[PDB]
Every structure is written in structure tokens, then in C-alpha cells.
Design an enzyme around this catalytic site. Structure first.
Site, PDB file in Angstrom:
ATOM      1  N   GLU A 116       8.050   0.334  -6.645  1.00 17.21           N
ATOM      2  CA  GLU A 116       8.412  -0.927  -6.013  1.00 17.21           C
ATOM      3  C   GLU A 116       7.737  -2.106  -6.697  1.00 17.21           C
ATOM      4  OE1 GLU A 116       7.889  -0.612  -1.741  1.00 17.21           O
ATOM      5  OE2 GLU A 116       9.710   0.613  -1.670  1.00 17.21           O
ATOM      6  N   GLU A 134       1.569   0.113   5.876  1.00 15.61           N
ATOM      7  CA  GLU A 134       2.951  -0.131   6.281  1.00 15.61           C
ATOM      8  C   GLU A 134       3.889   0.900   5.662  1.00 15.61           C
ATOM      9  OE1 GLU A 134       4.511  -3.849   4.865  1.00 15.61           O
ATOM     10  OE2 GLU A 134       6.566  -3.129   5.073  1.00 15.61           O
ATOM     11  N   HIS A 135       3.665   1.234   4.389  1.00 22.31           N
ATOM     12  CA  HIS A 135       4.448   2.270   3.725  1.00 22.31           C
ATOM     13  C   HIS A 135       4.337   3.611   4.433  1.00 22.31           C
ATOM     14  CE1 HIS A 135       6.553   1.656  -0.165  1.00 22.31           C
ATOM     15  NE2 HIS A 135       6.010   0.456  -0.075  1.00 22.31           N
TER      16      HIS A 135
END
Ligand SMILES: CCCCCCCCCCCCCCCCCC(=O)OC[C@H](COP(=O)(O)OCCN)OC(=O)CCCCCCCCCCCCCCCCC
Lengths: 445, 54
Positions: free
Chosen positions: A136, A59-60
Site C-alpha cells: 500500500e 487499523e490494518h
């Protein structure tokens, strides 16, 4: 015009399938905007300890380039038409959706077919995303609610894939090679696991014909024969206490094993949760709130916040309550929460069930406001129910709940059950697990 | 001498019958209450501690 007649006039969700097994679903309106996206049957519960974190990494890397839109050509293309490209991963799902004007649907679907199918997964961008995902992780540790719910999953589903976090431990993010990430997409990004959803000013026939020219090379075949399969996840009554008296507030999540998605007990349980409701210190009605726990917490300043939750997975779930309070009020919060649980199990009354059903209807209808909530509703519903449950059907299922139904279902799920407990912060006054476990039955009963 | 033992302890036979009953009741209760204690205490006896300083 009656709420009953408005539910019937809610438009239908057309569903059509491709030969590859991609499911195409859309709810049309006359709105000049739309939200089209791809929902995939993927998440960290399909990840093991070796590749845990691979889906979040993919997804990143999703918008960082494709074999045809090099790295920021995709970003410039999405931006230059005023559209919004979002993504999210959970333990069981992964979504990629665009918010565009209705006239941009052909380009929006062409952008997602490219993204979901042709991510370059470049070796140079994987290193750059390592440092972001590591950063993150540190940004995530600062959120006590996210930590406490990861803790609740880790102790509730210990030994099972559902204990894992989506992001993965900060040991796999630094080890996930390109080959890992390439293999995750090759194993999970398939048409039979994918739903192409749209909502808004979108005709279903045209979305269909876009999918069968953009997604039609999305196979459902698995390398040789190695198709991944489902693994049920044992629930464990257990406790995870992270004591840190430097944190000013304590977070406490407590949950029993709840139903999976397709279990009708979800409707009576959600109703019952609406009876306990939710509180924040910035609320308003406060001491006059109908929920007993809300009024006690507002009157006595017992907590900064509390919420009831019903998290569902394919075959199990987490049914419970998360509250944030100070170190000298955890005990009272647990006492009153368990007393309200027991009171629903043994003596739910008709009027509170009427209010709870009212709350559930309003939450369901208000949630579906806008094209993006409807698009997610469609994609997630086809992943979890294999269909879209219409609001009329939700109303018909709610209309069947009464105080007897609530008493029986809350007995079945809460009463005399072992909960998973997660505590974070100044939790010295969080009760011992035997004392919390004794709060799941009443001696008066 | 038998009669004199009875005269000193007229409760001899009843005391011994009660002793047999006590021994059987204890040979049931002590294991079961011990099981009760260990059921409550298993939460402490099996728990694991981890120290994660900064
Ligand atoms: C109180 C809660 C329990 C306290 C502990 C009791 C003793 C240990 C428990 C395990 C052994 C008990 C053995 C037992 O009860 O055996 C039976 C025996 C009487 O046997 P038998 O004379 O044959 O009569 C049977 C038919 N009625 O019965 C006995 O031998 C009796 C047991 C021995 C006496 C122990 C007394 C300790 C506590 C005294 C509390 C008194 C409360 C008084 C309240 C006011 C009353 C006006």
C-alpha cells in the site's frame, strides 16, 4: 418553511458519558439504517519516530480477528447482516464505524466494543499485514496529491510529530513488533479519548445502555502513571522540491500556518476560501465562474485542477492551496493564486463575501447528508470541540462574516507570511522561495 | 606653500569633509546591504539536496 426554521428543526445530538469517561453521542432520525462508530483521540502525531506507523498497523489488524471472533468470524458476522465495516486513521484521529440496519445496533456496538478492545494482534497476522502495508505504500507513491500533501506536512512541521505520515516510513512497518502494536493500543485506545457516536434510527437511551454493557470495561488508566501528553508543533516556512520530469504534471501545495480547530477565525477563513473556490478542467461554467482564479485557469488553460484547503489540528493548521498544472504554467498559477490571496487581504468586497458565505452554508448542509457523515460529524466534533456545534450555530457564525472581517482575517493569516511549499514533478518553473515569499505582500499596499 | 596648496585645490577641506561623511555612510551601508544580500541568499546557502534514484 425557511432555511432558518429548518435549521432549528434539525434534531439534537444527545451526549452522555460512562464512568470510565467514554462519551456517547447520537443524532436520531426515523431512517431504518444507522451508522455507529468509535472515534479515538489517536493518530500519528502521538507517534514518535520509533513507533510511527503503529496506529495504521493497528487499523490494518482491527478487523482481522479478536479474542472471541477468531479472524474472519467478525467479517462473516458483519457481512451476513448486510452491514459495512469501515475504518480510517488520520494524523490526529482514528475511527471504526459500521453501517447497519437500525435493528442491528446491538450487534454493531458489540462488534465495535470487541474490535476496539480485544484485537488479538496476532503475531502471524502482523507478518501478513506487513506485506500489505508495504504494498500500500507503493500504491500510495503513485498518487501525486497524497505525496505532495505528505511533503507539505513534512516540511511545514519539520522536527515535530506532525511532519510524520500516518503510515510511517517503509522502515518501521517492517520493524513494528507485536509489543509495539500492543503498547500503542494500551496507551491510546482509552475511554476518555474515545467517543461512541451513532446517527440514524438510533435512540440515545438504548445506545447508552449498549455502551454500558459492552464498553464499560474500557479503562482510562495508564500502566503506572505514564499518560501521554500533548506536544505543540512548530510551523516552518520552508520548501520541499521533488523534481521528476518524467511525471507529466506538476503538483504544488502551498500553505501558511492556519488556526487550530477551536479558533473562530476558521469560519471567516473557510468563507474566504470559498471565494477562491476550486477548479477542474471538467467543470462546466468555466470561463464564467465567479472565482477569478477559476475563470483565468479555464480561459487560459492554466491548470488541470486547483483547490483551496484549511486543514486543522488541535493548535495549528495548514491554510492554503493545491494545484495540478503543466510544467510551463506553474508560475502563472502561483502568480494568480497569490494575487487572489492579496486581493482578499486588502480589498475583499461585500458581494463576493455574500457568495462565499452562501457557498459555506451549502457545503456544510450538503456535507451532512446521510447517517455516516453525521456520525463522523458527531465523533470528530466531540474530539475537536468537546461538543457538537449545531447547524444553527454555524449559520449564526457565518452571518457575522463581512468583507471587513474577511480582509482582517486574511491579512492576519496570509499577508506577509512565510508559507510551506511542496512541489512534485516537472517543477523547474515553480518560483524560487524568495519569489513566492515576495508574493505574500503587495508593494501597492 | 600652504596658500599654494589651497590655490591648487580650493576644494581640499570640503573634499575631506565629504570623504569623512562617505566613510561613515559606507561603514553603515556596506554591512547592511551585505546583510540584505545574505538574507535573500540564505535560502540557497543552507538548502539541502538529496538524490533518490530508483
Ligand atoms: C544615486 C544613488 C546613490 C549613488 C552612490 C552615492 C555615493 C555612495 C553612497 C555612500 C556615500 C555617500 C556619502 C554622502 O552622501 O555624504 C554626504 C556628501 C555631501 O556632504 P556635504 O557636502 O557636507 O553636504 C551635506 C549636506 N548637504 O555627499 C556626497 O559625498 C555625495 C556622494 C558622492 C557622489 C556619488 C554620485 C554617484 C551617482 C550619481 C547620480 C547622479 C544623478 C543625477 C540626475 C540628474 C540631476 C540633474
Amino acid at each position: 418553511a425557511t432555511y432558518a426554521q429548518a435549521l432549528q428543526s434539525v434534531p439534537e445530538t444527545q451526549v452522555s458519558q460512562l464512568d470510565n469517561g467514554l462519551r456517547v453521542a447520537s443524532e436520531q432520525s426515523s431512517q431504518p439504517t444507522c451508522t455507529v462508530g468509535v472515534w479515538i483521540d489517536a493518530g500519528s502525531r502521538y507517534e514518535n519516530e520509533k513507533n510511527n506507523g503503529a496506529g495504521y498497523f493497528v487499523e490494518h489488524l482491527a478487523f482481522k480477528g479478536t479474542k472471541n471472533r477468531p479472524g474472519s468470524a467478525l467479517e462473516k458476522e458483519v457481512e451476513s447482516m448486510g452491514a459495512h465495516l469501515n475504518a480510517y486513521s488520520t494524523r490526529e484521529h482514528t475511527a471504526y464505524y459500521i453501517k447497519a440496519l437500525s435493528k442491528d445496533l446491538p450487534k454493531a456496538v458489540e462488534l465495535l466494543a470487541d474490535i476496539v478492545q480485544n484485537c488479538s494482534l496476532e503475531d502471524s497476522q502482523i507478518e501478513k499485514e506487513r506485506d500489505v502495508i508495504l504494498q500500500e505504500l507503493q500504491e500510495n507513491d503513485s498518487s501525486m496529491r497524497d505525496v505532495v500533501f505528505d511533503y507539505l506536512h513534512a516540511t511545514a512541521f519539520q522536527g515535530t510529530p506532525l511532519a510524520q505520515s500516518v503510515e510511517g516510513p517503509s522502515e518501521n512497518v517492517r520493524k513494528l513488533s507485536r509489543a509495539d502494536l500492543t503498547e500503542y493500543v494500551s496507551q491510546h485506545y482509552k475511554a476518555p479519548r474515545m467517543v461512541l457516536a451513532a446517527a440514524g434510527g438510533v435512540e440515545h437511551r438504548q445506545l447508552l445502555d449498549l455502551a454500558q454493557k459492552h464498553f464499560s470495561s474500557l479503562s482510562g488508566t495508564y500502566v503506572e502513571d505514564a499518560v501521554p501528553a500533548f506536544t505543540p508543533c512548530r510551523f516552518t516556512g520552508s520548501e520541499i522540491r521533488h523534481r521528476d520530469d518524467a511525471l507529466p504534471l506538476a503538483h504544488v501545495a502551498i500553505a501558511v500556518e492556519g488556526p487550530g480547530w477551536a479558533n473562530p477565525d476558521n469560519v471567516p477563513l473557510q468563507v474566504a476560501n470559498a471565494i477562491i473556490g476550486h477548479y477542474d478542467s471538467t467543470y462546466g461554467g468555466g470561463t464564467h465562474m465567479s472565482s477569478t482564479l477559476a475563470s483565468v485557469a479555464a480561459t487560459r488553460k492554466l491548470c488541470q485542477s486547483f483547490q483551496t484547503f484549511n486543514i486543522c489540528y488541535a493548535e495549528t493548521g495548514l491554510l492554503g492551496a493545491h494545484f495540478v498544472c503543466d510544467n510551463m504554467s506553474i508560475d502563472d498559477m502561483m502568480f494568480f493564486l497569490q494575487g487572489q490571496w492579496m486581493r482578499l487581504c486588502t480589498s475583499a468586497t461585500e458581494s463576493e463575501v455574500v457568495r462565499g458565505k452562501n457557498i459555506l452554508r451549502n457545503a456544510l448542509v450538503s456535507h451532512l447528508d446521510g447517517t455516516t457523515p453525521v456520525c463522523e460529524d458527531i465523533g470528530r466534533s466531540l474530539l475537536t470541540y468537546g461538543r457538537r456545534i449545531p447547524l444553527a450555530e454555524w449559520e449564526s457564525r457565518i452571518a457575522e462574516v463581512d468583507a471587513s472581517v474577511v480582509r482582517e482575517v486574511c491579512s492576519k493569516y496570509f499577508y506577509d507570511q512565510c508559507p510551506a511549499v511542496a512541489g512534485l514533478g516537472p517543477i523547474e518553473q515553480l518560483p524560487d522561495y524568495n519569489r513566492i515569499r515576495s508574493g505574500m505582500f503587495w508593494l501597492r499596499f | 606653500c600652504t596658500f599654494l596648496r589651497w590655490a591648487s585645490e580650493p576644494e581640499h577641506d570640503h573634499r575631506k569633509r565629504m570623504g569623512l561623511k562617505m566613510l561613515m555612510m559606507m561603514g553603515l551601508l556596506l554591512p547592511l546591504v551585505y546583510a540584505m544580500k545574505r538574507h535573500k541568499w540564505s535560502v540557497l546557502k543552507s538548502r539541502k539536496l538529496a538524490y533518490r534514484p530508483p
